[PDB]
């Protein structure tokens, strides 16, 4: 089967948390890039699988950028998860409730929760919920990229990383996709 291991395919928010992620998950493969969307994460996931580089646990840390197509994008990436893997979906957070995309990001997070609740080989990492509980990391920010100063960047990054680490713990006794 697929070798154990974790690969995170992530967006600009994941990239901001890169140091905290690597500290919380030593030995995880963190592939986060500014421009990544759910659409391109799906492509990256399959390219890695096809080159035999994708380990068992796949963390998709996307959703806030280009959120309009969330239903099709999240349905597709779940459908395209290869056999042999467990998937962690990191919900997105747009904090500005007046942004024209806010309702879309909120619907995307809710839809991802539905996919995780119903699919035995998926676990949620509910950053959307965590972010809402910590207004202090959003003071002075663009409401997406946590922390406006050194201390709150570190604090927000730790919260982000710990959300994913906890999801990985929850996933430990769960099945992979199999036929
Ligand atoms: Na599940």
Author numbering: 427 to 605
Source paper text:
SpOatAC crystallized in both the native and SeMet derivative forms and crystals diffracted to 1.12 Å and 1.8 Å resolution, respectively. The native enzyme was refined to Rwork/Rfree values of 15.0/16.8%. Ser438 is engaged in an H-bond network with His571 and Asp568 and the triad is positioned in the center of the putative active-site cleft of the enzyme. The oxyanion hole structure in SpOatAC is distinct from other SGNH hydrolases. Whereas SpOatAC possesses the Ser nucleophile and an Asn in Block III (Asn491 in SpOatAC), the conserved Gly of Block II is replaced with a Ser (Ser461). Moreover, rather than forming a type-II β-turn, the residues of Block II in SpOatAC adopt a type-I β-turn resulting in 180° rotation of the peptide bond. This orients the backbone carbonyl oxygen of Val460 (rather than backbone NH of Ser461) toward the active center where, together with the carbonyl oxygen of Val462, it coordinates a water molecule (w1). Another distinguishing feature of the oxyanion hole in SpOatAC is the positioning of its two component residues, Ser438 and Asn491. The Nδ2 of Asn491 is positioned 3.4 Å from Ser438 Oδ, a distance significantly closer than the average 5.4 Å reported for the equivalent distance between the homologous residues in SGNH/GDSL hydrolases.
